[PDB]
Scaffold this active site. Structure first.
Site, PDB file in Angstrom:
ATOM      1  CG  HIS A   1      11.761  -4.365   1.452  1.00  0.00           C
ATOM      2  ND1 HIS A   1      12.710  -4.792   0.552  1.00  0.00           N
ATOM      3  CD2 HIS A   1      10.649  -5.091   1.202  1.00  0.00           C
ATOM      4  CE1 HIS A   1      12.192  -5.735  -0.212  1.00  0.00           C
ATOM      5  NE2 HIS A   1      10.943  -5.936   0.162  1.00  0.00           N
TER       6      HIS A   1
ATOM      7  CB  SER B   1       5.728  -7.904   5.162  1.00  0.00           C
ATOM      8  OG  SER B   1       4.581  -7.933   4.339  1.00  0.00           O
TER       9      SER B   1
ATOM     10  CE  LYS C   1       0.838 -18.551  -0.669  1.00  0.00           C
ATOM     11  NZ  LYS C   1       1.075 -18.916   0.751  1.00  0.00           N
ATOM     12  CG  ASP C   2       4.716 -13.010  -5.412  1.00  0.00           C
ATOM     13  OD1 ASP C   2       3.831 -13.331  -4.596  1.00  0.00           O
ATOM     14  OD2 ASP C   2       5.561 -12.121  -5.184  1.00  0.00           O
TER      15      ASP C   2
ATOM     16  CD  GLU D   1     -12.701   3.915 -19.450  1.00  0.00           C
ATOM     17  OE1 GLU D   1     -13.405   3.043 -18.899  1.00  0.00           O
ATOM     18  OE2 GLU D   1     -12.482   3.922 -20.679  1.00  0.00           O
TER      19      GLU D   1
HETATM   20  C1  HEM Z   1       1.546   1.266  -8.139  1.00  0.00           C
HETATM   21  C2  HEM Z   1       0.756   0.550  -7.346  1.00  0.00           C
HETATM   22  C3  HEM Z   1       1.294  -0.152  -6.170  1.00  0.00           C
HETATM   23  C4  HEM Z   1       2.350  -0.997  -6.132  1.00  0.00           C
HETATM   24  C5  HEM Z   1       3.240  -1.431  -7.262  1.00  0.00           C
HETATM   25  C6  HEM Z   1       2.487  -1.423  -4.802  1.00  0.00           C
HETATM   26  C7  HEM Z   1       3.502  -2.306  -4.485  1.00  0.00           C
HETATM   27  C8  HEM Z   1       3.567  -2.876  -3.248  1.00  0.00           C
HETATM   28  C9  HEM Z   1       4.453  -3.893  -2.898  1.00  0.00           C
HETATM   29  C10 HEM Z   1       5.468  -4.530  -3.805  1.00  0.00           C
HETATM   30  C11 HEM Z   1       4.223  -4.189  -1.604  1.00  0.00           C
HETATM   31  C12 HEM Z   1       4.970  -5.239  -0.844  1.00  0.00           C
HETATM   32  C13 HEM Z   1       4.387  -6.614  -1.161  1.00  0.00           C
HETATM   33  C14 HEM Z   1       3.008  -6.711  -0.586  1.00  0.00           C
HETATM   34  O1  HEM Z   1       2.852  -6.595   0.599  1.00  0.00           O
HETATM   35  O2  HEM Z   1       1.955  -6.928  -1.382  1.00  0.00           O
HETATM   36  C15 HEM Z   1       3.189  -3.353  -1.134  1.00  0.00           C
HETATM   37  C16 HEM Z   1       2.702  -3.372   0.153  1.00  0.00           C
HETATM   38  C17 HEM Z   1       1.744  -2.477   0.625  1.00  0.00           C
HETATM   39  N1  HEM Z   1       1.092  -1.548  -0.078  1.00  0.00           N
HETATM   40 FE1  HEM Z   1       1.348  -1.189  -2.032  1.00  0.00          FE
HETATM   41  N2  HEM Z   1       1.554  -0.873  -4.015  1.00  0.00           N
HETATM   42  C18 HEM Z   1       0.786  -0.087  -4.782  1.00  0.00           C
HETATM   43  C19 HEM Z   1      -0.311   0.682  -4.420  1.00  0.00           C
HETATM   44  C20 HEM Z   1      -0.706   0.792  -3.104  1.00  0.00           C
HETATM   45  C21 HEM Z   1      -1.740   1.609  -2.657  1.00  0.00           C
HETATM   46  C22 HEM Z   1      -2.583   2.491  -3.536  1.00  0.00           C
HETATM   47  C23 HEM Z   1      -1.820   1.454  -1.289  1.00  0.00           C
HETATM   48  C24 HEM Z   1      -2.772   2.107  -0.380  1.00  0.00           C
HETATM   49  C25 HEM Z   1      -2.882   3.425  -0.310  1.00  0.00           C
HETATM   50  C26 HEM Z   1      -0.821   0.518  -0.911  1.00  0.00           C
HETATM   51  C27 HEM Z   1      -0.614   0.125   0.389  1.00  0.00           C
HETATM   52  C28 HEM Z   1       0.253  -0.905   0.724  1.00  0.00           C
HETATM   53  C29 HEM Z   1       0.359  -1.448   2.074  1.00  0.00           C
HETATM   54  C30 HEM Z   1      -0.416  -1.000   3.280  1.00  0.00           C
HETATM   55  C31 HEM Z   1       1.279  -2.424   2.021  1.00  0.00           C
HETATM   56  C32 HEM Z   1       1.713  -3.259   3.196  1.00  0.00           C
HETATM   57  C33 HEM Z   1       1.570  -4.747   2.904  1.00  0.00           C
HETATM   58  C34 HEM Z   1       1.351  -5.503   4.178  1.00  0.00           C
HETATM   59  O3  HEM Z   1       0.916  -4.934   5.143  1.00  0.00           O
HETATM   60  O4  HEM Z   1       1.642  -6.806   4.232  1.00  0.00           O
HETATM   61  N3  HEM Z   1      -0.153   0.132  -2.046  1.00  0.00           N
HETATM   62  N4  HEM Z   1       2.802  -2.548  -2.173  1.00  0.00           N
END
Ligand code: HEM
Ligand SMILES: CCCCCCCCCCCCCCCCCC(=O)OC[C@H](COP(=O)([O-])OCC(O)COP(=O)([O-])OC[C@@H](COC(=O)CCCCCCCCCCCCCCCCC)OC(=O)CCCCCCCCCCCCCCCCC)OC(=O)CCCCCCCCCCCCCCCCC
Ligand SMILES: CCCCCCCCCCCCCCCCCC(=O)OC[C@H](COP(=O)([O-])OCC(O)COP(=O)([O-])OC[C@@H](COC(=O)CCCCCCCCCCCCCCCCC)OC(=O)CCCCCCCCCCCCCCCCC)OC(=O)CCCCCCCCCCCCCCCCC
Ligand SMILES: CCCCCCCCCCCCCCCCCC(=O)OC[C@H](COP(=O)([O-])OCC[N+](C)(C)C)OC(=O)CCCCCCCCCCCCCCCCC
Ligand SMILES: CCCCCCCCCCCCCCCCCC(=O)OC[C@H](COP(=O)(O)OCCN)OC(=O)CCCCCCCCCCCCCCCCC
Ligand SMILES: CCCCCCCCCCCCCCCCCC(=O)OC[C@H](COP(=O)(O)OCCN)OC(=O)CCCCCCCCCCCCCCCCC
Ligand SMILES: CCCCCCCCCCCCCCCCCC(=O)OC[C@H](COP(=O)(O)OCCN)OC(=O)CCCCCCCCCCCCCCCCC
Ligand SMILES: CCCCCCCCCCCCCCCCCC(=O)OC[C@H](COP(=O)(O)OCCN)OC(=O)CCCCCCCCCCCCCCCCC
Ligand SMILES: CCCCCCCCCCCCCCCCCC(=O)OC[C@H](COP(=O)(O)OCCN)OC(=O)CCCCCCCCCCCCCCCCC
Ligand code: HEC
Ligand code: HEM
Lengths: 388, 244, 70, 32, 64, 59, 39, 51
Positions: free
Chosen positions: A207, A211, A233-234, A277
């Site tokens: 945030h 994004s 959408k979500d 797993e």
């Molecule tokens: C507990 C698991 C995770 C949750 C709840 C989570 C949650 C979120 C949320 C809410 C966003 C913002 C909405 C979105 O762009 O989809 C986001 C974005 C992002 N997440 Fe995660 N995430 C998780 C795991 C990961 C992992 C493992 C990675 C990679 C190592 C990651 C990398 C990113 C990146 C790069 C973005 C940027 C989105 C964009 O570029 O538009 N996330 N994540």
């Protein structure tokens, strides 16, 4: 505007932070459904927490009572089979959704600046998920549970000087007995809250820097509020996920598991096929492929080093894969390699799977080693293709 | 070698309880419990199933009460600290044939007859494997003479299994006059075992059908909702003052 | 996190004056053609290694088993 | 304004009672 | 109490006689050898796999 | 139209709308449950617990 | 038409939420073995 | 090993001792209020009942 009398409750201080960060956060207008996958991973985490609490209302962490307690949950508790199948298959869907999250990030190069902190916090989150799922899978105390715990904890002996001491200290008593069972139950209960904290930090950093979007371009021209445009959408994503997860719960609940975990743990005999797993299988395949177990542990550390080293690359100007044909092909090859690597991990160490795994892991690291070269050449592109 | 080690693969039989709308054959569950009590309970145990589990599934409550009153179990200390045996009630689990694993192994030549509660979920391709294992006591192939004290069974990993061929033609007399043959007895006992491993299958299937249908309707509504909310954005015309 | 204005002119119609579930069906053949002609290469690079490796593995397993068959 | 306000409050109370019955279907309380 | 499974497998024995012929060829080779490890369980597995695949639906449609 | 009629009925105050939503949820769930039960009973005739020939002959 | 489609989906959602809540609460409720031992 | 138990179960102990259960002495000085003085006095104060 002087806020003399209050207009809207959403702009009141009680709901002001929530207003900004949930309703009014500007979002690129052209997002596809993989951002929905990120939100879906959040929902999967919440589902896991709730079902896990209600399961722990019935689970006994003792070695003599754990398995029969789980069978209690399945047979006697009112609607307990639903709770247990939801917890297990929800772990599986949590990992599926996080994998799709990660691979969208890789495809659109969301790890690039200025989202290096977002990517790094994501890597930390992935580590926490791995540890939590492993210690949780130890809890039911079956053959696969006990023997997987034994193997994965005993490969910590690869540390040069303090390996044996760490193994014995983590085991608590020369084996994987009751002490390890209680230890793992407490840790499995504790870790998801650290996971929630890590997720909140993840979202806060994102945030901060906005994004990304399917184009990878600057996107402050056409931006729309998060609600209601991306909530709906979500919501479509959530309902589709609910149908998928309901297919898994009710009709094929034991497909994503192994039948050896329904036999009470017997440290005397050894099941012929010890595998983790399905969502640990790629890592297991890399580690098994590289021999000299010290080398295997070093290779896992190297995997995480590469994952952390993606964001800090030199030129990498063009971001999205829609304008990077070479990188698009490289990414698809990497995804095929990851799937093949996961499949190799379930196979025995007999040939040719050793050769296939030793090639697949090398190709994995090759992907991680040839992105800067593409970035440098692409930085060289503009002064060659000029049309004049 | 490896082939015998992993055992001859088990076919895919058309079980009556297979399909998105398919229930246990409860008459077959009753018949399978009969055959298990008659021939299989001498060596194998369940220890995860109470007599009350049979009420409303294959037996009526009075029948289960009589069946439980047949056997006697040890009850806790009385007012003198001594132990005693009383007829089993409607809550007691199925009796165990052996004192413990050591006694079981000693009685069965070092091999431990496994607990049968979750047997069809503790094997790959459970129900087909169990049926094939019970029915396929075949003559061993040429030049593979196995040692004395075992029996050849192609589906069992390694080919040599420790239990003898139990299911024989005419072994039991079914209550309802069904002609007892090896295949029929195997089918009934595997149906009973599959019910034992999963007593919630019918409720689970009904819930799954109802909720997949209901959530499909919800998905249609959610798609329409999203399209409606986004249609002021997707069908818009903007003039930007730029060409190339 | 400032917003850059562009000096456009935008006309938009209310959501209750438009067909809401017809754009999904208007041009199915053209859309299928576009998907295939734009992603056939990526499909080959994804499913190519998998199918090739699978064929190689079954082939080698067949050879090995038949060779060890006395 | 008070008649409209009390009418709306009663309508919301009826809705709340309907939601309560839906959540906890009690023919035991409904019959007497 | 004639065994439906045995009768059905005997009936379907001439359906895929080719694995059976291969198994008999191995039987003749092993009889000639009479000294080696001489198992060839692979032919056994192929033949009985074919018979089991045949007797899949007929068994249950014949059972009560 | 029928949509306009039912709108003028139950879409002028939100309280009535929420009550209608709850009532429709209850009624629709009951209807779907009845339909699925009829389908299940039709598909699994003979296999039920209530219709096995020796249900009360052990005594 | 839009509001009626939305209403159908809305009471589908209400059904789902009631199901989940009741599943959790009744799971936290009593158990079959206890009820058997009620005598 | 742990210290042996004089009786198989609490009911056996009660039957041996005429319905009285001799409590476990592991935490007797912490289970009873003013445990040490109480135990010493109880062991040594076996006096004659009043009139
Ligand atoms: C507990 C698991 C995770 C949750 C709840 C989570 C949650 C979120 C949320 C809410 C966003 C913002 C909405 C979105 O762009 O989809 C986001 C974005 C992002 N997440 Fe995660 N995430 C998780 C795991 C990961 C992992 C493992 C990675 C990679 C190592 C990651 C990398 C990113 C990146 C790069 C973005 C940027 C989105 C964009 O570029 O538009 N996330 N994540
Ligand atoms: C492989 C096979 C590929 C076949 C491709 C066929 C094709 O032309 O597809 C593109 C074509 C439209 O192309 P597009 O405009 O690029 O895609 C739509 C946009 O994404 C914009 O989508 P939309 O919002 O306009 O439509 C909403 C909704 C429309 O779909 C529905 O309403 C129901 C769909 C049911 C599918 C089964 O869903 C979709 O269109 C597809 C995305 C569904 C959400 C997925 C989110 C992730 C779920 C993850 C779960 C966990 C793992 O879509 C279809 O053909 C699908 C509809 C077919 C007719 C049925 C209509 C029912 C009403
Ligand atoms: C991403 C989403 C991946 C979903 C993978 C689902 C899964 O684990 O399915 C295997 C799971 C294993 O069950 P099974 O193979 O029947 O029983 C295991 C036996 O040992 C019999 O096993 P088998 O020898 O017959 O074959 C074992 C084979 C299962 O065989 C098949 O799947 C055959 C094709 C179907 O196992 C696998 O393929 C497991 C690995 C596949 C997932 C690898 C995901 C890697 C993601 C990227 C990792 C990146 C790491 C670094 C990140 C930074 O289920 C199935 O194979 C059947 C259901 C498949 C549903 C697919 C569509 C829904 C998803
Ligand atoms: C009950 C299931 C109804 C399934 C309807 C599928 C679509 C039928 C054709 C149609 O009118 O589509 C256009 C309509 C939308 O209308 P529209 O505005 O897109 O189209 C108007 C133009 N004509 C009439 C020519 C098509 O699609 C839907 O209504 C989609 C289904 C939403 C309703 C879901 C109800 C769930 C209840 C629980
Ligand atoms: C249930 C979980 C609710 C989570 C809510 C979000 C996390 C808490 C945020 C608290 C916070 O820092 O609030 C800041 C705000 C300070 O007041 P204000 O001057 O309006 O600040 C606007 C920001 N510049 O703080 C306040 O005005 C006080 C806010 C109190 C917390 C209300 C949370 C919602 C309760 C329902
Ligand atoms: C199976 C595993 C899937 C994993 C998916 C990870 C994310 C990949 C992704 O984002 O693919 C989207 C991409 C669309 O290309 P893009 O340039 O983003 O959009 C242009 C729109 N006309 O998609 C493509 O370019 C091609 C998508 C299909 C490739 C595989 C097809 C067979 C399966
Ligand atoms: C046996 C041991 C050795 C094994 C490897 C040996 C071979 C090495 C690679 C040889 C081939 C390299 C080809 C590089 C030039 C690609 C040219 C190019 O970009 O062509 C344009 C084309 C655009 O595609 P499109 O838009 O669909 O075309 C329509 C046009 N109107 O673009 C495309 O079609 C995109 C093609 C992308 C291909 C990416 C992968 C190949 C190139 C890098 C190989 C790296 C190998 C190691 C890493 C693998 C991944 C981890
Ligand atoms: C978090 C959840 C929301 C919390 C809201 C209260 C927050 C703290 C008080 C804030 C100040 C206040 O009084 O807010 C109430 C608000 C005032 O209205 P406002 O827009 O500020 O200006 C008009 C001036 N009268 O008035 C409103 O916004 C009107 C809201 C009236 C709601 C009444 C109906 C409730 C019906 C029962 C619940 C739903 C029934 C169905 C479900 C039953 C259970 C299953
Ligand atoms: C909040 C706590 C709700 C407690 C509650 O309602 O418990 C259920 C209890 C018994 O009702 P129940 O067992 O559903 O009915 C028997 C046959 N109709 O309900 C009752 O005994 C009466 C409940 C009346 C409505 C209570 C609403 C609060
Ligand atoms: C005593 C003799 C019996 C009787 C009457 C039955 N079984 Fe069997 N069984 C017995 C032993 C000693 C063993 C162990 C063999 C070994 O695992 O080496 C078994 C094994 C089984 C198995 C397990 C096979 C496997 O794990 O691959 C099953 C599924 C099994 N037995 C089933 C079974 C049934 C259904 C019986 C009633 C007809 C039955 N057994 C009788 C000993 C004995
Ligand atoms: C604080 C929240 C959580 C609690 C209290 C919790 C508690 C439990 C308990 C008691 C079990 C054993 C019950 C059983 O055998 O089904 C279990 C199993 C398990 N948990 Fe969790 N859990 C929580 C969150 C998670 C999370 C976030 C994951 C990661 C996806 C996870 C993964 C697992 C796995 C894989 C199992 C084994 C599944 C199986 O039983 O086969 N848990 N958990």
């Amino acid at each position: 505007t002087i806020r003399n009398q209050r207009f809207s409750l959403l702009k009141e201080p009680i709901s002001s932070t929530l207003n900004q960060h949930l309703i009014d956060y500007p979002t690129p207008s052209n997002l596809s459904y993989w951002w929905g996958f990120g939100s879906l991973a959040g929902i999967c985490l919440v589902i896991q927490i709730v079902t896990g609490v209600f399961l722990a209302m019935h689970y006994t962490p003792h070695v003599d009572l754990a398995f029969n307690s789980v069978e209690h949950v399945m047979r006697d508790v009112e609607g307990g089979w639903l709770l247990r199948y939801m917890h297990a298959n929800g772990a599986s869907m949590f990992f599926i959704v996080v994998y799709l999250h990660i691979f969208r990030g890789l495809y659109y190069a969301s790890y690039s600046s200025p989202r290096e902190f977002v990517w790094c916090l994501g890597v930390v989150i992935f580590l926490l998920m791995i540890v939590t799922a492993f210690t949780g899978y130890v809890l039911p105390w079956g053959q696969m549970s006990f023997w997987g715990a034994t193997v994965i904890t005993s490969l910590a002996s690869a540390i040069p000087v303090v390996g044996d001491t760490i193994v014995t200290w983590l085991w608590g008593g020369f084996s994987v007995d009751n002490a390890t069972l209680n230890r793992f139950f407490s840790l499995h209960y504790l870790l998801p809250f650290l996971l929630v904290g890590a997720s909140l930090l993840h979202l806060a950093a994102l945030h901060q820097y906005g994004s990304n979007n399917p184009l990878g371009v600057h996107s402050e021209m056409d931006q729309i509020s998060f609600y209601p445009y991306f909530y709906v959408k979500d919501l479509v994503g959530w309902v589709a996920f609910a149908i998928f997860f309901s297919i898994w719960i009710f009709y094929a609940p034991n497909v994503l598991g192994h039948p050896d975990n329904y036999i009470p743990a017997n440290p005397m005999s050894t099941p012929p096929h010890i595998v983790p797993e399905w969502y640990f299988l790629p890592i297991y395949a890399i580690l098994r492929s590289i021999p000299d177990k010290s080398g295997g542990v070093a290779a896992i550390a190297l995997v995480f080093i590469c994952l952390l080293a993606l964001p800090f690359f030199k030129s990498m100007y063009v971001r999205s894969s829609s304008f990077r044909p070479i990188y698009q092909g490289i990414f698809w090859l990497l995804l095929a390699d990851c799937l093949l690597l996961g499949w190799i991990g379930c196979q025995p160490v007999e040939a040719p799977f050793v050769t296939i795994g030793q090639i697949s892991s090398f190709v994995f690291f090759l992907f991680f080693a040839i992105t800067p070269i593409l970035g440098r050449v692409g930085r060289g592109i503009p002064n060659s293709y000029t049309t004049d | 070698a490896d082939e015998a080690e992993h055992g001859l693969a088990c076919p895919s039989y058309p079980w009556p309880h297979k399909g998105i709308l398919s229930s246990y054959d409860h008459a077959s569950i009753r018949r399978g419990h009969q055959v298990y009590t008659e021939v299989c309970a001498s060596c194998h145990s369940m220890s995860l199933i109470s007599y009350r589990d049979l009420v409303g599934v294959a037996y009526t409550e009075e029948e289960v009460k009589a069946m439980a009153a047949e056997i006697e179990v040890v009850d806790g200390p009385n007012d003198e600290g001594e132990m005693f045996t009383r007829p089993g009630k409607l809550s007691d689990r199925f009796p165990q044939p052996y004192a413990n694993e050591a006694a079981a192994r000693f009685a069965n030549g070092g091999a431990y007859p496994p607990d049968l509660s979750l047997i069809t979920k503790a094997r790959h391709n459970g129900q087909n494997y169990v049926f094939s294992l019970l029915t396929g006591y075949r003559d061993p192939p040429a030049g593979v003479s196995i040692r004395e004290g075992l029996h050849y069974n192609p589906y069992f990993p390694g080919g040599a299994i420790a239990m003898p061929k139990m299911l024989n033609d005419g072994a039991v007399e079914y209550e309802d006059g069904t002609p007892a043959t090896e295949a029929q007895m195997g089918k009934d006992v595997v149906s009973f075992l599959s019910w034992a491993a999963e007593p919630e299958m019918e409720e689970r299937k009904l819930m799954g059908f109802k909720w997949i249908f209901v959530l499909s309707l919800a998905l249609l509504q959610a798609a329409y909702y999203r399209r409606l909310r986004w249609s002021v954005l997707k069908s818009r015309k903007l003039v930007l003052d730029v060409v190339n | 996190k400032q917003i850059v204005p562009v000096k456009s002119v935008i006309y938009a119609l209310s959501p209750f004056q438009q067909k809401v579930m017809t754009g999904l069906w208007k041009d199915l053949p053209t859309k299928i053609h576009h998907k295939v002609s734009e992603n056939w290469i990526s499909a080959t690079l994804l499913l190519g290694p998998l199918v090739g490796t699978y064929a190689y593995v079954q082939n080698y397993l067949e050879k090995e088993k038949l060779h060890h068959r006395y | 304004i008070q008649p409209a306000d009390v009418k709306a409050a009663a309508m919301w109370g009826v809705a709340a009672a309907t939601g309560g019955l839906y959540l906890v279907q009690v023919s035991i309380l409904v019959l007497p | 109490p004639v065994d439906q499974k045995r009768y059905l497998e005997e009936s379907c024995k001439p359906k895929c006689v080719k694995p059976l012929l291969e198994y008999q060829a191995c039987i003749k080779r092993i009889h000639g050898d009479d000294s080696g490890q001489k198992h060839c369980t692979g032919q056994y597995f192929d033949y009985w796999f074919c018979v089991d695949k045949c007797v899949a639906p007929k068994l249950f449609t014949k059972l009560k | 139209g029928i949509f306009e009629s039912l709108y003028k009925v139950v879409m002028r105050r939100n309280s009535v709308y929420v009550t209608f939503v709850i009532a429709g949820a209850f009624l629709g769930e009951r209807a779907v449950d009845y339909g699925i039960h009829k389908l299940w009973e039709a598909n699994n005739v003979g296999k039920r617990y209530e219709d096995i020939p020796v249900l009360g002959q052990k005594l | 038409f839009a509001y009626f489609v939305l209403t159908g989906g809305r009471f589908v959602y209400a059904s789902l939420i009631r199901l989940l809540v009741l599943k959790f609460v009744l799971s936290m409720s009593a158990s079959k073995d206890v009820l058997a031992l009620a005598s």
